[PDB]
Amino acid sequence: NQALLRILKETEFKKIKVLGSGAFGTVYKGLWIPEGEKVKIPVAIKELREAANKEILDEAYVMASVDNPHVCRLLGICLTSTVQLIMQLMPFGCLLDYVREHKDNIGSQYLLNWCVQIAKGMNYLEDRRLVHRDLAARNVLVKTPQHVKITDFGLAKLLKVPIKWMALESILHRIYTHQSDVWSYGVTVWELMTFGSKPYDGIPASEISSILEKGERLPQPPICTIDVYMIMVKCWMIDADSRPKFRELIIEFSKMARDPQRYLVIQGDERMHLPSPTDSNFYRALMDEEDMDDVVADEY
Amino acid sequence: QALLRILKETEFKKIKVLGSGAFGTVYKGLWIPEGEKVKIPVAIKELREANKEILDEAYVMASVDNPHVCRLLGICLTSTVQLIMQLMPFGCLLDYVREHKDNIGSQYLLNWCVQIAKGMNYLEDRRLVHRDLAARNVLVKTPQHVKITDFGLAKLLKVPIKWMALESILHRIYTHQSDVWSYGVTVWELMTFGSKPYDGIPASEISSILEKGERLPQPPICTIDVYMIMVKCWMIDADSRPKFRELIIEFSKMARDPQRYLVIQGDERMHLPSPTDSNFYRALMDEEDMDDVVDAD
Amino acid sequence: NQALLRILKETEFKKIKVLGSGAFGTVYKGLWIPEGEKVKIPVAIKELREKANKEILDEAYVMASVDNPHVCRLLGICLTSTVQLIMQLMPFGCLLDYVREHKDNIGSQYLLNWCVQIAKGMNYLEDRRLVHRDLAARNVLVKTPQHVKITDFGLAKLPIKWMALESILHRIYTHQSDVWSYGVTVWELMTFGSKPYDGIPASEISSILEKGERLPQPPICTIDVYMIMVKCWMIDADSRPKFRELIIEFSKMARDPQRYLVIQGDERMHLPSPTDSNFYRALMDEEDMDDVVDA
Amino acid sequence: NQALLRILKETEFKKIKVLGSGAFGTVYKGLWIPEGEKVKIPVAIKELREKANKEILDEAYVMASVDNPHVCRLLGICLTSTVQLIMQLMPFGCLLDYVREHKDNIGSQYLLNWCVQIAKGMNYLEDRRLVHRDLAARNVLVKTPQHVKITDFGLAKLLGKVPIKWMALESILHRIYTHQSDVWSYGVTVWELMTFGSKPYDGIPASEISSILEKGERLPQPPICTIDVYMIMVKCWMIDADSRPKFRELIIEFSKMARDPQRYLVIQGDERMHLPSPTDSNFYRALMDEEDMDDVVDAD
Ligand SMILES: */C=C/C(=O)N1CCC[C@@H](n2nc(-c3ccc(OCc4cccc(C)n4)c(Cl)c3)c3c(N)ncnc32)C1
Ligand SMILES: */C=C/C(=O)N1CCC[C@@H](n2nc(-c3ccc(OCc4cccc(C)n4)c(Cl)c3)c3c(N)ncnc32)C1
Ligand SMILES: */C=C\C(=O)N1CCC[C@@H](n2nc(-c3ccc(OCc4cccc(C)n4)c(Cl)c3)c3c(N)ncnc32)C1
Ligand SMILES: */C=C\C(=O)N1CCC[C@@H](n2nc(-c3ccc(OCc4cccc(C)n4)c(Cl)c3)c3c(N)ncnc32)C1
């Protein structure tokens, strides 16, 4: 439908503060003040740095379309010297910032659930036949810690290359496929379990293709179980078809979720607490009204 | 005509992504009747890939009227083709057995086998050839009531070489006797709790190996008496393979004494359905008349 | 008589290897050295699980007594703290084991022939009017692919799945009972060494026969072959075919092996030529015997 | 026989290297000097951690009495405050290590055969009435690529962390050891070989494992392992020992598979890697393997 995307007047919105920056565009926290109304509402706006707008509009129209709990939805667009994108605002920000910040605090149960939601969100993309082209811990967002959602997908299509994230087929031949996405998906999984460290740190981007060919893959994190790592390792496979399909990642991660403590070894995991039903429910009402699949602990 | 309903894209929506099938992508769905507040859960299959041709094939599928054959409720025609049928929460038997694999009854497994044959047999009666039959293609309306699906879908339009008969493989010949051979693979899938036949072996190799006689392994649970039935299905000469109609009786007889035929760890601990339990499932889950489940005599 | 059975001092023979463990006794590969002889000649020795020694000897004397192609004759007994039985070594060894190994590569003709061969041996035991009490595919030894010899017959002084209902119910052993034990043995061959009543507890065995739920019929087996097995297992001993009948039926069956037993790709795999077979007899089967039936 | 095993004076032999360490002992590569001879012969020395000396000799006498192609025999022992065990030294050493090194290029025909060979060695142990109590690939030596033998059997009884992952549940829970339990270890042994030396129940604490085995978890199908082979492993891991397969049955089942190895295991470039020619095998026999051994199953 063209119902999904809303055309926003520059008069309609103003940008109060800068949340973040991305290679594609700067981002803001914004107020949308409705025509004919008194109130001012918080929203997140990103304006592209460089910019066939009608061609883009066709792209945005799809971006608006997606309907998954774990996938971000593009509410609106504004066209000017610089294109403006309007979407829901996430206070928590990306997972990457969230995990790095919470490294001492974080516990086994959450990390796996996040992995599952990404798979769910990503799986929707595959069925929709959409290629994100950029899955990274940064790209994913937290509506709330329990609920996380994928984002910034198709932007490359809308319009500075992350070699360390990219799959070998991607690096060598500029080939992007859902399976390529897994390699990134694996990289993202590596990202969380490292609690925000940066892959292939200090290594020249140019050198990267050779190392993958050499088979010197990213090391497995101390917290990470070999069972979990092997899963990561599988994602990083030279042949894309060989790499696990998205569904499998959804199924396997969840099983771990049923028994989170055994798979991931985290200091003081037992002591740190997953949210109580009271804790999750409160968060849901205030922010997460949208009905999303209940998170799996199964042990507790 | 009366049997199959032609929907309007306005009429329903695929809300939840469901499953991946080589034949199709399956979506949980909601049906909104005009003038009505209510929404009805449906299963939607979207087919990857002549409008008239489907209708002839489609009408027959709407046609099937057996407890153990799923019927196609509606067809919606568009750049892509969507097949409407009732939603089964349990979905694949293959999914169900593997998920519940550690624990299952002898009684259930034989009963499914009996249930599958009754359905396959009916298709046989109707002169419908499945071409492709598998555990994956059989889904659970309810635990005691699995139903056979995707029948004849294969014929109309990745090939299941491991499932297929040698006669089917060698010259792409499909017959009811060819189906029977598949049934053993389906019977075999369950007794192994969801395993894969000729697992991981190349398809190219398989046609040669069947000739070599290197048949599927006997499952640990399986009694020889059960394994022999499968072996008969996989006989190279099609005609020699037992008819489903025979197949129904043998499993039904076995179901009378489930423990003697199939060996299970802690089966006694595991519970056959309570009569009360069976009735409760019927009331909400299953409202369709069907033959009664076999119970130990 | 005195001549038939040799009593050997422990000195005469030394065991070398454990081929297998019998339920009744352990079995070894042992070497026999003749007095003042450089040569060591291979034999197989059985040590009983472990009465009166004299009584046992009488039983051995009977066991020595049998001379038949399809029955095994005990050459030697050693009397000591533990009884030892010596009989000629067979490299193929167990019949039951042989089928399991060769199920993929085995021809139709051989299976029928073995059925005929056992039946004649069981029949000799019958004429002598001695009852085996324990016929098993395990207890038949392959002298050569074309020859088999039943053994472990008698051993009364010293299995439910094999055992006949009458024997199981009342500890009754009769020739008719031996036919029932024989019926299982055919199944084992046809099954290619399938374990009968696999996974089923022994306690269940008495009732199911009472129920009447039999051993299943093997895929290779023709309808005709299976029925013979079924006749053999019957509630009333008398109804079950005599061995002579079984010998006659099978041999008739052996004349046209293909019709009775259906084996995939049967034609390609065949019984060896007389020229080959002659080689087998001379090297191993020096013994006077019936030649194998040919279609 | 007394002759079979020889007591040795300290003076005759020395430990020139420490090859490896084991739960029982430290294994040293040592040379043996015969009196009045100018040359040294390589042997393998194992020293115990540290039961009267006479008591030990009786167990030891048994160890040196075992003649089988696939079961290792002990040449000599030295009585001391420490106890030293001497046996032939094989350059390939551990079978388990061999599999790890050779993952890149191990032929299908070999892997099935080692199973025949380990089983053959195991059956003899059963016939002899000896229960190994700690069978693992680690405990299987490689005399030659074609020929591998079983070692370290019966060592376990003398000592007083157990190898829990290998152990049958009966052993874990009630310290019960039987041939049937032994099959379970053999089953694990098959798993290690098939998976090219990967650790069993890796990353999982010992305490959980007895609990997990009851739950019904069993080690995963090796990626290169066909379903037929996996079932065989699975039976071994049965709770009811008696249902669990006997070795002779085990020997028979692998031999059939050996006839058509490619059918029962899938390895990349299995066609490329083929069993060594008779000329190649014959060469090996004479140089390091004079002793007679049972014929290898050949697919041809
Ligand atoms: C295959 C069944 C099994 O487990 N076996 C254990 C040893 C290997 C096989 N086997 N057994 C003998 C064998 C059988 C019987 C023997 O004497 C008993 C006996 C009873 C009644 C009459 C007579 C004359 N003997 C002996 Cl001594 C040995 C085997 C022989 N002899 N050769 C190869 N394999 C044998 C059965
Ligand atoms: C491979 C695991 C490991 O780390 N090892 C350390 C050295 C390399 C391997 N290995 N062990 C021996 C070995 C084993 C046992 C030995 O004597 C004990 C013993 C017990 C039971 C029977 C017998 C005959 N011996 C000795 Cl002395 C040595 C190796 C030998 N001998 N050669 C190469 N590698 C060996 C294990
Ligand atoms: C790691 C990212 C980070 O640290 N940021 C700083 C805080 C704000 C973060 N952020 N980005 C967006 C955001 C993302 C994407 C947006 O439009 C792109 C897009 C692409 C495809 C589909 C859709 C629906 N949108 C926009 Cl407009 C904004 C944030 C939002 N929206 N809210 C809160 N933080 C956001 C980046
Ligand atoms: C185990 C197979 C698998 O991976 N699946 C994906 C998950 C969902 C599973 N599943 N499939 C259907 C299903 C099957 C077939 C369907 O239509 C085909 C068809 C054609 C003609 C006639 C009939 C009767 N059917 C449809 Cl529409 C749906 C599921 C259903 N229906 N419910 C739950 N799970 C289902 C298979």
Numbering used by the authors:
A (entry chain H): 700 to 750, 755 to 862, 875 to 1011, 1013 to 1016
B (entry chain E): 701 to 749, 755 to 862, 875 to 1014
C (entry chain C): 700 to 749, 754 to 861, 877 to 1013
D (entry chain A): 700 to 749, 754 to 863, 875 to 1014
Authors' account:
EGFR is a receptor tyrosine kinase, which upon ligand EGF (epidermal growth factor) binding will result in auto-phosphorylation and subsequently lead to activation of downstream signaling pathways such as RAS/RAF/ERK, PI3K/AKT, and JAK/STAT pathways. The aberrant activation of EGFR leads to activation of downstream signaling pathways associated with tumor growth and progression. The first generation EGFR kinase inhibitors, such as Gefitinib, have shown great clinical efficacy for the EGFR mutant driven NSCLC, but after a period of treatment, most patients will develop EGFR T790M-induced drug resistance. The drug resistance is mainly caused by the higher binding affinity of ATP in T790M EGFR protein compared to inhibitors, and steric hindrance due to the mutation.
In consideration of these limitations, we developed a novel highly potent EGFR inhibitor CHMFL-EGFR-26 which selectively inhibits EGFR oncogenic mutations including L858R, del19 and L858R/T790M. As expected, the crystal structure showed that the acrylamide of CHMFL-EGFR-26 formed a covalent bond with Cys797 of EGFR. The aminopyrimidine formed two hydrogen bonds with Met793 and Gln791 in the hinge binding area. The Met790 oriented in parallel with the cholorophenol moiety and formed a beneficial hydrophobic interaction. Furthermore, the Cl-atom formed a halogen bond with Leu788 carbonyl which presumably contributed to the high binding affinity. Furthermore, despite of the similar covalent binding via cysteine 797 residues in the EGFR kinase with all other irreversible EGFR kinase inhibitors, CHMFL-EGFR-26 forced the EGFR kinase to adopt a distinct “DFG-in-cHelix-out” inactive conformation, which is rarely observed for the EGFR kinase inhibitors. For all of the sensitive mutants, when C797S mutant was introduced, CHMFL-EGFR-26 lost activity significantly (50-10000 folds) which suggested an irreversible binding mode via cysteine 797 residue. Combining the results that CHMFL-EGFR-26R, which lost its irreversible binding capability, completely lost activity against those sensitive cell lines, these further confirmed that CHMFL-EGFR-26's irreversible binding mode observed in the X-ray crystal structure was biologically relevant. CHMFL-EGFR-26 showed an IC50 of 19nM against EGFR T790M mutant, 71nM against EGFR WT and 215 nM against EGFR L858R mutant.
